[PDB]
Paper text:
The contractile tail of Agrobacterium tumefaciens bacteriophage Milano is flexible and bent to varying degrees, which sets it apart from other contractile tail-like systems. A contractile sheath and rigid tube assembly is a widespread apparatus used by bacteriophages, tailocins, and the bacterial type VI secretion system to penetrate cell membranes. In this mechanism, contraction of an external sheath powers the motion of an inner tube through the membrane.
The structure of the tube in the contracted tail has long been assumed to be similar or identical to that in the extended tail. However, this has never been established experimentally. During 3D reconstruction, we removed the sheath contribution by an iterative, three-dimensional masking procedure while applying the helical symmetry of the tube. The structures of individual tail tube subunits in the extended and contracted states could be superimposed with an RMSD of ~0.7 Å between 127 pruned Cα atoms. If we compare a stack of three hexamers in the tube rather than individual subunits, there is an RMSD of ~1.6 Å. This analysis shows that the overall structure of individual subunits and the tube as a whole are indeed the same in the extended and contracted states, as had previously been assumed. Notably, the tube straightens after contraction, suggesting that it becomes rigid and suitable for cell-membrane piercing.
Numbering used by the authors:
A (entry chain I), B (entry chain I), C (entry chain I), D (entry chain I), E (entry chain I), F (entry chain I), ...: 3 to 129
Write the structure that this text describes.
């Protein structure tokens, strides 16, 4: 009742990079039991000798598999439009992503798409 | 009755790149339960630092596995002829592909072919 | 009775590349349920930007796994001799390959060989 | 949606150096993911002792790889005609080059040309 | 009762690399049956000829999969903060890691994170 | 079907510089996926200060890699005879080269030769 | 009774490359149901354009997994000694290999070794 | 937490060599994981016989790759303006460069520029 | 009773490479059913044309997975100390390894370590 | 069977330049898959302005990599003796070279030598 | 345990060429697996005809890549100060270099410097 | 067993050019799989017009990479002493070099040295 590891709402606000047409927020449903993966830290460390690391700038990757909404063209899930993802988990965790961009669009069978979203920062409510 | 994830008709119009002989449209049947994958967006983004991406021009890939029609030579499914694919799913989604070209022909056992179609754009009816 | 996906006769005519000794045609039996794969088109397209492709010349690959005939030395199935393969499927499809050459000979346990045949063209009866 | 590193329009206006026939502007497409390189400064400094430099006059080099337009002869991309390049990037950056001249024409396979353009100045919109 | 191969307490003390805010120690729970892997030796040998090796300096890698604590932001598990890990196994083995740094942050579904910790030395109680 | 970047026919007419024996036209096949490079402009510009160039007379270089025809001696591909190359691409582009001369003959393994052809002008059909 | 695909006798004659001590022939037993793979042809063809191949000289590889004989040191199965393998299958096929050399010795658990034997020629009785 | 090899702030103060318009300081972001290289010593020794060297006066080179700020024209990164670079690394190292001058401007794709800065001296905080 | 393929005693004598503290011999237990792999030959042959090989000097690799002894620090199993391994199998085979060195230390969960030992020679009792 | 790009026999007749001792013909084997390169034309053209060339006298270079025959001293492959090379390819092409001279002897590991042969003319059978 | 190819201690004593301030000895750590290269001989021979050489005086070059110590300014590693390097390898080899001078200072990213040290002589302990 | 391309013994006899102290012969081990290159001919031909060559006197270069013997100072491998190299390969080839001289000493990491030996003649046993 308090210890449920799962997503509850995926509110995505699409905006076309060219026409700047804001479509959203539109709730989405997961296609399977796999949960969206996150990476909040924007600095990717690398391994060096004797415990040293190289703090290099990187992105806040977010892999969000969702069922494509029939009202939304499939192109918007594959880099053709910016995504403003707002995922709230069952345990209260809410992470708002703003001005994301699908970097590596992979083939989708028309219903279940998988986004590899990239943004400068990923917020977190942390209940 | 409204929530069926599957293809209904695959109307492909083959035209030989050399002789310009238009053969089609010819309905095709799926060889298994795997559905055709799509990628409508023609711009493939790439991951860069701190949320930036590089909008690079690319193609609208479409992987369409179909049962080869006995009336059509197998060469037409392996780059020897342009394909005009018109796939209509069970939920009303219809995506017309025009002037495609099989880029990476793989070996087919004579019945089940798998096309990796490449076109400048993939339309979508989006019911 | 008309919709059987399988091979019926594999008539291979071996000729030694050096001695020019034509041995064949000799019917062959499949070692398992895997069917011979084909690629009739001799031009392998490659993916480029926004729907363009590069028509490059290539070969008509044919992967034919057969049970090695005890009357034929195993070397003939591994590039030591040209193969003239003539495969007729159960649905009437007959594809004649002439002057092939096994390009990548892999190890065979003495009974089941797998040829990766390469020829300039693969004909097709197409019933 | 605002942080896309890529070109959007490449409007080139060719004019033959001899006949003074102005052909253009004609939008061009990039052949790959490599972006056009620029050098706005027309004074190339050189390294000297203890922090001093020699301000020497030079050109505003611009390396612009584009897909050759079928309506335009390939000679115009290889020094035979002046180019008036007008590149607008995805982030609003627009740089107008006037009266350029391809200085080092390299071999092109007929589709993808690479110009090494030289002009006295390269403007910049700088959004 | 003495021969139990498993972890008992994972006391991690996070400190932000930027703000130097020390949060911890906070006990953590394993997400599955996989145990944390260790490598105490900071010199990674390499294979050479006839039994010789090249003693090269390296790090004391420690792969620690833990359930992310809801009180701690997920960024701290992905390189955004130094980790002071103190793992005590069931058989008395206690290994204190100080001033570690997650080098390769991978995507986590919000509950189960996997750290690839790097430190100059890994102590060991060795009961 | 219209956007194929590749060569279709390479009709070369060899004539011996000494005996004036015209052998050709003889169609040739490409040895790999690399396409013939061209340079139609016969004036090679050079970079000077502040946007100026030096229009200097040069040649219309054409690098044409072809499979040597067994009926033709290999010497004819290495400067021993004038070449009249007539390459027609898949997109309709046809460029006729007359009275060329291989300037830098490089070693060929007996099958795949690479000509560095030099002529005063390279025509272009430009469909 | 005539159609048994399996090995019957593996008579290997080891001779040390240094001391020239000929130990053998010693019959060997297979460790599992996997049969020795062979490749009699000493010329490995490679795929080229439009049906052409490059006849390149190679070896007659033979992968022979056998149970190591307790009377023979394990080093002899891992390149330390030449092997004269003489395998006779159940269907009468007998292939004599002379002056072989294990090229890639892999780790063996002390009982089941796997040799990757290389020889200039592999004979065949071919009943 | 103390052993991070990376840059934190790159405060560059541009001033136009002609108009003397001081623009800055403006923080910059690295385009990749490559760190700015430095050379503090202004005397470049040269190798001579038997351990002797020739102390010759030189510059304090600094190669600083940064993401070009959209508010700043690209010319300022390519010698058109003096740069006052102030780089502070993650380990406390801060090196102030004053009155630098980009000596060898190379082509930049509009976002990621690479400066080869030359100054009489490079200071160092050395924590 | 005579045909048991398994290890009986693994007597390892650790000596620290730095302090030269000889700890051992200490019997070890296998963590699973996988047996230690060996390679006695110190010359690794490589495949060449038509049956020739290149005798190149190499090491006598030995992969020994053992349960780490609680009295021994885990670092000694990961290159921090030389190992003198003495494995006696159930069938009488005893192979003494002297002055080994773990070359590629991999992560161990604290109980089951896997050594990739390298030594100039591996002896063998060969009952 | 007719389209094999490879060498079959390399009959080289060595004669010492000093002692005039004719040793040969001795068949040679290729050390790898690289084929001998040829250049039959003895006149090397050079590029000039507007399609003109300078017919300059040169040699008929032939790069022939062969496995050194143990009966022949290695010096004969490195300029110490004249070579009379007679290479016959698999497709019938036979090119006889007479009174050649290795001009640039490079280091050979004792087995695989590479000759850069120079002769006034290279004949060709041209089947 | 005796056959470890690697460095153990790099004791460098810096002294400023101008102020004569002796800072050191300060132990240094290698930044990667590359070992310091040496050249003890101070006479560099040159190749002449028929086995003769020209004994010419030169230096004892030593390329020593080390991690720059935070207590030492980076200028001292780039010719601004004399270095007294004392490297002791793992196998007992200790080579003392006195009054060296970095001749060719290259750019360092602030942590890993590479010195090209030049001295009249390089001693060697040679255990 | 007879076709092993590799070295077996490298007996080098060092003698100091100054003190005339003969140290050797001392067997050496190869550091990797690269074999010593040789050039027996002492006359280096050069390419001239129409098949003529210029017989010019040169040296018998021998590149011998060996593991430096700990009993021998590293200077002896870098021109400080004459080398009397005696390499015997696995196939019986033995080449004695007398009064050699390392001409171009390159940096060695203390274990693996590479000599560029020059002598008036290189003998050969030629089994």
């Amino acid at each position: 009742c308090n210890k449920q590891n799962g997503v509850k709402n995926i509110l995505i606000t699409f905006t076309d990079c060219d026409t700047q047409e804001v479509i959203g927020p539109i709730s989405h449903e997961q296609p399977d039991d796999t949960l969206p993966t996150y990476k909040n830290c924007a600095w990717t460390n690398t391994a060096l000798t004797n415990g040293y690391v190289q703090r290099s700038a990187s992105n806040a990757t977010m892999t969000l598999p969702v069922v494509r909404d029939l009202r939304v063209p499939l192109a918007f899930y594959q880099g053709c439009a910016q995504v403003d993802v707002q995922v709230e988990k069952f345990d209260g965790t809410v992470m708002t992503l703003t001005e994301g961009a699908v970097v590596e669009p992979e083939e989708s069978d028309g219903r279940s798409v998988t986004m590899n979203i990239v943004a400068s920062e990923i917020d977190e409510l942390l209940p």
